Amino acid sequence: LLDDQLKYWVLLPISIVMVLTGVLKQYIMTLITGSSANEAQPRVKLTEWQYLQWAQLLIGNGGNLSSDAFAAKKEFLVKDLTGNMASFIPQTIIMWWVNHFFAGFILMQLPFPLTAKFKEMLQTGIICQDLDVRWVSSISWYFISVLGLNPVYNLIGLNDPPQSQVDKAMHAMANDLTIIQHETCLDNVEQRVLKQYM
Amino acid sequence: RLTTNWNRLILDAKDTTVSDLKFGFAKILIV
Amino acid sequence: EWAKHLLDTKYIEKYNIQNSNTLPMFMYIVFQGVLMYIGYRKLNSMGLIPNAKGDWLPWERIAHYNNGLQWFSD
Amino acid sequence: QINATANVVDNKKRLLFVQDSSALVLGLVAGFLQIESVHGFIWFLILYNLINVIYIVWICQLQPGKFYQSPLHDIFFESFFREITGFVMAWTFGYAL
Amino acid sequence: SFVSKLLYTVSALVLFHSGFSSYEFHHLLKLNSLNNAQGLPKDIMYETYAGLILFVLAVFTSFEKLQYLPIESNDGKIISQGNYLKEIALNKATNVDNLIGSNPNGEIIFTPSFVDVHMKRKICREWASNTVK
Amino acid sequence: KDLVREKLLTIMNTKAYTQFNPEQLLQLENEMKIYMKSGDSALTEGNYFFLMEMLFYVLVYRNQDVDAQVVYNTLRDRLGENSYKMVIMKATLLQINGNDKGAIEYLENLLNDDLEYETDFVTYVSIAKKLIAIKTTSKNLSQESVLKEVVALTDKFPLDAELWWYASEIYFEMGQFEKACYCLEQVLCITPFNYACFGRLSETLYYEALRSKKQTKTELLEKALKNALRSVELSELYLKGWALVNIISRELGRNKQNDLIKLSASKLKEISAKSNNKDKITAELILNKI
């Protein structure tokens, strides 16, 4: 075959619109998500929330290096305590767009041999029945675009309950963290350091 | 190659006549 | 330790009493593999299988019938 | 217990830029060599892995560990379906010339 | 001017010119074939391999051996690690910060809020004394 | 020269200016302004305004201060004055411009307007910090400053490690040296890998041990060893962890620690190598003195 100089008006617009549409998508998604605060509510509830977070981090952070100081905390603890839209919106709409404006062409030649049923779906524009395995219509180039475009976005540069009973649940975890795990540090540090830095 | 192509290197206008001959439309029919 | 080393090299006895708050195993791979089974079985085997005879039509040999004759004619 | 840091977030990400930069110039060279498919795939693999090892040679100073966790895992097979399809984009667009 | 961004531009452009060269030869490979009833890649290939190797080279020099200065001093005293990247082990990563007199904990150590309000008053008085100094 | 911004990136995050000599601080502001005005390339807007206020606060730290008004007026363009920083800049301006206490009461009702949580928790955390910083000038110094911290600290925000760290200083200077150990443990609770709370938590134990009984002397020294060794796992050339290990080993000097003295000496001589600046003077002083 001999396709004639439509490489300007389709292939470039297809890559170009994918580039702009995704860059816009990241800008739009970033715009849509705004917290701008936690809330504007009274003082107390965030205050005891961060107390709860202090307990939570004590589970991870402070529950390792406190062989002497483990028990001293626990008295205190008990007393003190007690996008899919981003997928759907752009790309489905532009499937309609491309089939609307770009149809009924053989746009290019993929380099690789597909199987016949790939050649079933891709050429809905053309109405030949034994054309070839390799040639493809316009919409196939889109089908290759969406899954291959992550390097482009990198290279241009872009990047990514009950109020009281749950307190009792973490008080039960305060009870659990007493002797569920007493971690072996401030005992093996001499062994570990002599094992290393030689 | 550098010299000849740099001389080349130093908008659409949709002209019909070259299109005809490239696709073989321009032909002589001997009857 | 411009000042901490200096404070350590000499002797210091500065302290007093203050209130101070008055503070007091191959299962994982066996498990995961069938999830590779399910897509190939259910959808890629919809119409997209190699090794069945319809995939070699591009590679099918060109039957040679005459190979020494022309049959020019009207 | 080997310590891990948020430092790695940069250098890990940094590596991606090298490979993604090495994955859209590929495809174009394949298309300009005007190639069939399986020749193209083997060409892709040999250039891709030579780029990977020379990256381990030069940017990394022959010390893949001490820069990444699971380093032998990550240089070869991580981000491998993240860029093979980009290579297909590059290869289709190049071979149309 | 260092060679990396130069090499990016010349490598993209030499690939672009190899592109126009291959445009002319390979468009006139099948278009001229139409004149022959559907009837030098080699130096094209050699200049292509030049372009690929040079672009590969181009990417490397955008990565430099990391080189640093001391925070407290005002002389140069340029601190070289002889290293390209930044490592993952927290102990020696903490090293490369401690070559500087800095602490990524930062504010917790220094407590800017209490210190500053006295610091500005006394420091203006203090340097006013040091103005002879 | 883009290498300059690296220090600036440090100086915003580290507040390195805070403990700088006015001689080198004056150098710093001069060295800054040339790159601030000249090297305007390739740096983010957020970094721009963080550098711009850090110019303001250097200038207030400087002995000439009229330029502070310049920088503040140029930086007043964005987000008005409601963010935490412009509350800081206006308070320190109103407090320095005439040496009038006024900003506190204009800030006082602000916290009574924070009763609705009109701003984020970190904001009035910092307001609590800087209003106390004002008040310790109102009440020029006392131990009850910490008692004031308690009504601000144990009631509202344990999470700020800076508060417990600062409280440690006032306990450590003349107060009981044991509650600093608890508070520094709490600092460890907040952040896993503070390796200077590690050195300090051992030093406060050592100073406590200097005034304790013999069995408590050995007990606290042994705990101090294991805390200074806990320093070492977070860093190789950390001058203060290795040094404090070597110090209590100088005090004790017993056979296995004599080997650790040899290892610490190799590491401390590596530290006292000239890769490090000025700190080497303190490191070498203790190395070669005894």
Side-chain angles (χ1 to χ4, degrees), chain A, chain B, chain C residues 3 7 19-74, chain D, chain E, chain F:
Chain A
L1 280 73
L2 293 160
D3 291 331
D4 48 349
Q5 189 272 331
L6 77 167
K7 290 171 56 52
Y8 298 176
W9 291 271
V10 193
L11 268 175
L12 274 190
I14 289 281
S15 70
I16 286 279
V17 300
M18 290 314 78
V19 164
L20 269 70
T21 52
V23 163
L24 271 293
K25 194 69 184 168
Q26 268 204 9
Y27 289 3
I28 287 280
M29 294 298 102
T30 43
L31 171 54
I32 288 281
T33 61
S35 165
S36 83
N38 312 128
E39 280 301 77
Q41 64 93 29
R43 180 52 44 73
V44 63
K45 297 311 181 168
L46 65 91
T47 302
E48 76 167 34
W49 181 65
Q50 47 77 14
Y51 297 170
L52 183 63
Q53 298 300 110
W54 170 64
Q56 288 169 8
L57 61 83
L58 172 53
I59 297 161
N61 285 342
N64 48 13
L65 296 175
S66 308
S67 68
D68 197 341
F70 265 126
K73 299 173 275 273
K74 277 72 174 173
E75 295 97 359
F76 303 163
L77 294 174
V78 304
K79 180 67 174 66
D80 291 331
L81 187 49
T82 51
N84 189 359
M85 72 292 291
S87 160
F88 193 10
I89 279 153
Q91 74 95 27
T92 81
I93 295 295
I94 58 153
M95 270 315 179
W96 164 91
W97 180 78
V98 175
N99 208 352
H100 187 195
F101 277 46
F102 304 91
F105 308 146
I106 301 299
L107 184 148
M108 61 80 70
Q109 190 160 21
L110 303 171
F112 51 104
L114 292 63
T115 46
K117 296 301 299 298
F118 278 123
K119 159 69 187 86
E120 189 277 331
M121 211 155 268
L122 300 156
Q123 310 193 344
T124 307
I126 191 167
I127 54 176
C128 182
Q129 301 290 303
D130 54 357
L131 164 50
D132 209 327
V133 65
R134 264 166 64 171
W135 275 275
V136 299
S137 68
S138 164
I139 198 75
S140 83
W141 166 230
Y142 180 76
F143 173 101
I144 280 151
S145 178
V146 171
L147 277 296
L149 184 63
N150 290 318
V152 165
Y153 295 121
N154 171 229
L155 281 170
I156 192 174
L158 276 189
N159 293 70
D160 53 8
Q163 201 78 2
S164 180
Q165 189 267 320
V166 74
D167 314 333
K168 312 311 188 220
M170 283 74 75
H171 186 200
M173 295 299 291
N175 285 318
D176 167 69
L177 59 85
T178 57
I179 207 74
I180 192 70
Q181 176 48 241
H182 37 282
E183 194 276 332
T184 47
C185 283
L186 307 171
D187 46 17
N188 291 279
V189 184
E190 204 286 334
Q191 295 86 316
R192 288 187 251 102
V193 71
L194 270 284
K195 184 63 221 73
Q196 71 208 31
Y197 290 125
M198 283 74 74
Chain B
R1 287 270 74 72
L2 185 147
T3 53
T4 184
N5 298 296
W6 200 328
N7 167 40
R8 205 224 74 73
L9 175 53
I10 290 154
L11 313 185
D12 315 329
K14 289 80 64 173
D15 291 334
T16 307
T17 186
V18 71
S19 173
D20 311 339
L21 188 146
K22 303 258 179 292
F23 308 145
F25 284 5
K27 271 183 164 63
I28 308 171
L29 181 63
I30 313 311
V31 301
Chain C
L7 264 67
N19 300 338
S20 310
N21 195 10
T22 65
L23 194 145
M25 306 326 194
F26 273 51
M27 51 66 78
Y28 275 117
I29 190 167
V30 171
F31 151 73
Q32 274 290 8
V34 166
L35 182 54
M36 181 146 298
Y37 202 72
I38 196 150
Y40 153 79
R41 200 207 90 69
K42 198 71 175 179
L43 276 296
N44 194 316
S45 197
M46 189 208 207
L48 278 296
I49 62 171
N51 310 319
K53 189 70 195 79
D55 306 306
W56 315 119
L57 295 174
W59 284 269
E60 182 65 26
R61 186 178 295 276
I62 190 167
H64 316 279
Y65 272 95
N66 53 66
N67 211 344
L69 301 177
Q70 302 82 19
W71 184 33
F72 294 120
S73 89
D74 50 350
Chain D
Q1 203 284 335
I2 188 54
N3 201 324
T5 58
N7 191 286
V8 71
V9 166
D10 186 74
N11 52 45
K12 205 172 211 313
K13 186 160 88 186
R14 190 88 173 284
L15 188 153
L16 192 149
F17 214 80
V18 166
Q19 274 314 79
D20 272 356
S21 58
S22 158
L24 313 190
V25 55
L26 300 178
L28 277 296
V29 69
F32 284 11
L33 186 53
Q34 295 293 346
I35 62 171
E36 62 86 9
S37 87
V38 298
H39 190 64
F41 264 51
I42 61 176
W43 259 96
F44 169 84
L45 276 296
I46 58 176
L47 276 296
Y48 192 68
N49 58 29
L50 270 63
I51 296 169
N52 282 277
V53 55
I54 191 69
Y55 173 83
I56 300 299
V57 168
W58 204 323
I59 297 88
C60 179
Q61 294 94 297
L62 306 160
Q63 201 197 350
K66 187 60 181 295
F67 300 134
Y68 312 88
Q69 70 276 17
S70 85
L72 188 153
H73 178 280
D74 298 1
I75 192 66
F76 304 117
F77 296 96
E78 183 178 1
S79 82
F80 184 72
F81 204 79
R82 203 199 159 73
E83 62 92 31
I84 193 66
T85 317
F87 166 73
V88 175
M89 191 185 318
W91 189 14
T92 61
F93 199 85
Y95 184 80
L97 269 288
Chain E
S1 89
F2 57 89
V3 285
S4 198
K5 278 278 179 178
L6 183 62
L7 279 156
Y8 277 171
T9 301
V10 72
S11 59
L13 284 165
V14 72
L15 282 159
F16 191 78
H17 182 74
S18 188
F20 265 106
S21 311
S22 310
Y23 207 98
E24 291 146 80
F25 292 165
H26 303 317
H27 288 65
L28 302 174
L29 176 54
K30 165 142 161 183
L31 188 153
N32 193 19
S33 295
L34 289 162
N35 196 357
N36 190 359
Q38 296 291 109
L40 305 173
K42 298 288 197 301
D43 56 342
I44 283 281
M45 170 284 258
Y46 287 132
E47 67 181 2
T48 302
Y49 278 104
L52 277 296
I53 285 155
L54 294 166
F55 192 88
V56 175
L57 284 157
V59 173
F60 293 101
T61 303
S62 74
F63 284 55
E64 293 82 3
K65 293 291 194 189
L66 313 182
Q67 211 198 5
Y68 304 75
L69 278 260
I71 190 72
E72 86 196 325
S73 174
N74 307 313
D75 187 74
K77 288 170 191 153
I78 317 302
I79 290 161
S80 166
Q81 280 267 352
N83 181 16
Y84 277 124
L85 315 176
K86 49 174 50 50
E87 65 88 16
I88 57 173
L90 183 138
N91 53 341
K92 287 177 279 293
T94 299
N95 221 326
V96 312
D97 176 84
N98 296 115
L99 274 162
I100 298 89
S102 65
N103 310 321
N105 189 359
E107 77 297 352
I108 310 306
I109 297 169
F110 301 105
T111 79
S113 67
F114 306 119
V115 61
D116 58 3
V117 67
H118 295 287
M119 185 64 72
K120 60 98 175 177
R121 296 210 200 73
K122 70 97 180 179
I123 194 179
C124 75
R125 294 187 280 271
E126 174 273 345
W127 182 66
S129 307
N130 290 318
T131 312
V132 71
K133 190 201 85 69
Chain F
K1 172 50 58 162
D2 68 331
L3 275 286
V4 177
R5 49 145 156 72
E6 280 71 349
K7 323 312 181 298
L8 295 174
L9 291 203
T10 307
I11 294 146
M12 283 74 75
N13 56 54
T14 318
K15 281 66 62 171
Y17 54 74
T18 309
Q19 70 276 16
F20 280 0
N21 174 16
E23 311 307 298
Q24 69 197 129
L25 192 149
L26 187 136
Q27 193 280 340
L28 187 153
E29 196 276 313
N30 296 138
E31 197 72 0
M32 185 179 288
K33 59 173 72 155
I34 49 158
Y35 180 71
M36 181 45 247
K37 297 285 196 211
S38 313
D40 306 341
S41 289
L43 61 84
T44 75
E45 288 98 20
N47 294 136
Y48 203 82
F49 305 117
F50 275 118
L51 293 173
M52 184 176 177
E53 54 82 14
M54 184 277 287
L55 211 63
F56 153 75
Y57 286 102
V58 166
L59 286 166
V60 173
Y61 264 49
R62 287 283 298 290
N63 318 299
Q64 50 76 20
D65 296 334
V66 70
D67 311 331
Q69 287 74 352
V70 176
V71 174
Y72 181 75
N73 306 131
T74 48
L75 188 42
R76 219 213 305 270
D77 292 331
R78 292 161 207 83
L79 185 54
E81 299 83 0
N82 77 317
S83 87
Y84 73 112
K85 291 287 264 181
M86 283 74 74
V87 173
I88 297 169
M89 283 76 76
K90 67 97 185 174
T92 184
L93 194 72
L94 174 53
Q95 290 282 1
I96 199 181
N97 60 351
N99 290 329
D100 65 89
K101 189 56 60 163
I104 192 79
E105 54 262 33
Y106 273 70
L107 183 148
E108 188 275 334
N109 59 348
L110 213 66
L111 188 61
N112 309 121
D113 301 318
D114 303 351
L115 272 159
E116 292 76 359
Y117 195 58
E118 68 194 352
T119 47
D120 198 73
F121 64 93
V122 300
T123 81
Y124 65 91
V125 167
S126 296
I127 302 163
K129 276 188 288 198
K130 298 292 183 182
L131 70 85
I132 296 169
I134 297 169
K135 194 69 72 69
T136 183
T137 303
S138 301
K139 267 54 64 174
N140 304 3
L141 176 59
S142 173
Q143 195 85 25
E144 64 89 21
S145 76
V146 178
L147 300 173
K148 287 189 291 200
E149 292 161 43
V150 184
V151 295
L153 168 51
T154 71
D155 295 332
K156 329 288 294 187
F157 297 109
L159 269 286
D160 184 9
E162 182 269 4
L163 297 173
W164 292 69
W165 199 93
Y166 177 74
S168 170
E169 287 173 329
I170 295 283
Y171 291 180
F172 154 74
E173 52 91 21
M174 185 63 72
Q176 51 263 66
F177 289 68
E178 186 274 331
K179 293 179 179 179
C181 308
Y182 176 83
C183 290
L184 293 174
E185 172 47 280
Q186 182 49 226
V187 175
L188 181 61
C189 295
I190 314 316
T191 179
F193 292 162
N194 188 358
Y195 55 94
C197 181
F198 274 30
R200 184 177 178 179
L201 176 58
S202 56
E203 177 273 354
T204 180
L205 296 164
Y206 171 65
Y207 277 45
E208 181 158 301
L210 290 173
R211 61 185 73 266
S212 300
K213 292 184 278 289
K214 179 56 174 132
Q215 53 80 22
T216 44
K217 274 153 164 178
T218 305
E219 187 204 342
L220 293 169
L221 289 162
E222 282 288 333
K223 202 170 160 46
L225 276 296
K226 207 70 147 189
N227 303 12
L229 269 73
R230 270 297 315 179
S231 312
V232 165
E233 69 89 12
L234 288 87
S235 168
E236 197 201 295
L237 259 66
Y238 178 44
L239 171 153
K240 175 61 58 56
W242 291 97
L244 193 146
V245 164
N246 170 43
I247 283 293
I248 302 159
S249 307
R250 286 273 73 74
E251 295 295 344
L252 300 169
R254 52 217 177 190
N255 303 146
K256 183 260 282 167
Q257 280 68 241
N258 280 317
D259 163 82
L260 276 75
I261 294 168
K262 293 187 278 294
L263 194 145
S264 192
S266 47
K267 296 264 162 176
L268 286 157
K269 288 175 236 299
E270 198 185 3
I271 291 154
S272 196
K274 313 306 184 198
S275 60
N276 178 15
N277 187 28
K278 301 310 171 182
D279 291 26
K280 65 182 181 293
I281 303 167
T282 187
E284 62 86 20
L285 177 142
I286 302 293
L287 272 163
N288 65 354
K289 174 176 88 82
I290 190 160

